[PDB]
Design a binder for this molecule. Structure first.
Ligand SMILES: CN1C(=O)C[C@@](C)(c2cccc(NC(=O)c3ccc(OCC(F)(F)F)cn3)c2)N=C1N
Ligand code: NA
Ligand code: NA
Length: 371
């Protein structure tokens, strides 16, 4: 409890490609790099020699493998994968010193799924059975972990945004954050769904009906890059960001993520860009708190050229790696809540730092949840 030195720094990544943890599958152990994803619930790994893959799960080499004689087809907004289900023994070398029998989808065919030049070979879905494929009876990895061991039912993520971070499995490490943790309820256990009750650009309320902020949900997703905002909120959001930053100008396609914008080295105008604060539902009736992110988070370097990493959505708000890089995030599954604290490692400047602040008084927070 509170100290987990062995798990500190167990995440690696490359800008834009996601954060991955080393895992082993089967006996003898086959080592793989696995994308950490709080936005999905399948443990799926490459199982065949796709060209983009450094390595892949070779089921034939494992004595502990058990076929479930069952297929799964998984389409996404763009790209898909399909696979064959089974179970085998899984470990996390730089995680808890346990071994569990987990479901694994062996990916036999995929499209627009693996990334050319990336260093991961599979994906660890850390969300709940409700959104598992093909259905809620396929038990996600973290459930199997907690069912079969003494590992406490919670994990936490410090994503530092070439890149690194920590996934503390079964606890919290106090060195990873400064100040206090503030908790927001998990509304329903499927995605890590939360409720945003208020949005400020540079301390300026959007004055939108709060239901709009959560239309049709808001979730915390380490497998998404952007802060994704519902269409109507996004319009409001950029309009207010465009205005707060009207001190300089950029093409209209830039705000739509259809082009990059570039400045010279040692000289990006951070300060003409506003802070963004999301107030989240608190643990107590009529009590909220707010998280504050910097343009450092929503203006992401591409290779000085940057992409605007706030985008519109038809699936609701997504607090991707943009938000998460500001914070140490606690997925407290045992108490159905998400904790936020200022990350000890977040990227800032000398004028502004990311922040988690409370308590604030906010009424009718229940009306902010879409049904
Ligand atoms: C959004 N999403 C999906 O569309 C489906 C799924 C399974 C998925 C599938 C394939 C790839 C990914 N995610 C990524 O490639 C990715 C890339 C960069 C990411 O962040 C990088 C940075 F940290 F922002 F720099 C996070 N995830 C997610 N999970 C999701 N969370
Ligand atoms: Na247990
Ligand atoms: Na601390």
């Amino acid at each position: 409890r509170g100290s987990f030195v062995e798990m500190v720094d167990n995440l690696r990544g490359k800008s834009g490609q996601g954060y991955y943890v080393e895992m082993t599958v089967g006996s003898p152990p086959q080592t793989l790099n696995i994308l950490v994803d709080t936005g999905s619930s399948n443990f799926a790994v490459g199982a065949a020699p796709h060209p983009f893959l450094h390595r892949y799960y070779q089921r034939q080499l494992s004595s502990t493998y058990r076929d479930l004689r069952k297929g799964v087809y998984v389409p996404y907004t763009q790209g898909k994968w399909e696979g064959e289900l089974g179970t085998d023994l899984v470990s996390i070398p730089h995680g808890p010193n346990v071994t569990v029998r987990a479901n694994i989808a062996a990916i036999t065919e995929s499209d627009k799924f693996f990334i050319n030049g990336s260093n991961w070979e599979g994906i660890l879905g850390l969300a709940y059975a409700e959104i598992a494929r093909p259905d809620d009876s396929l038990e996600p990895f973290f459930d199997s972990l907690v069912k079969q061991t003494h590992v406490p039912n919670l994990f936490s993520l410090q994503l530092c945004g070439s890149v690194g971070g920590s996934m503390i499995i079964g606890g919290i490490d106090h060195s990873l954050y400064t100040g206090s943790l503030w908790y927001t309820p998990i509304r329903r256990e499927w995605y890590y769904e939360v409720i945003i009750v208020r949005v400020e650009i540079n301390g300026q309320d959007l004055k939108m009906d709060c239901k709009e902020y959560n239309y049709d949900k808001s979730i915390v997703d380490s497998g998404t890059t952007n802060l994704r905002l519902p269409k109507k909120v996004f319009e409001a959001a950029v309009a207010s960001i465009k205005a707060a930053s009207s001190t300089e100008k950029f093409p209209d396609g830039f705000w739509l993520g259809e082009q990059l914008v570039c400045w010279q080295a040692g000289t990006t105008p951070w300060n003409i860009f506003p802070v963004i604060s999301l107030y989240l539902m608190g643990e107590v009736t009529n009590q909220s708190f707010r998280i504050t992110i910097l343009p450092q988070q929503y203006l992401r370097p591409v290779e000085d050229c940057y992409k605007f990493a706030i985008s519109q959505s038809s699936t609701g708000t997504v607090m991707g790696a943009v938000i998460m890089e500001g914070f140490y995030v606690v997925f407290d599954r045992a108490r159905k809540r998400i904790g936020f604290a200022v990350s000890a490692c977040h990227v800032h400047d000398e004028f502004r730092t990311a922040a988690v602040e409370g308590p604030f008084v906010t009424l009718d927070m229940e009306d902010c949840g879409y049904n």
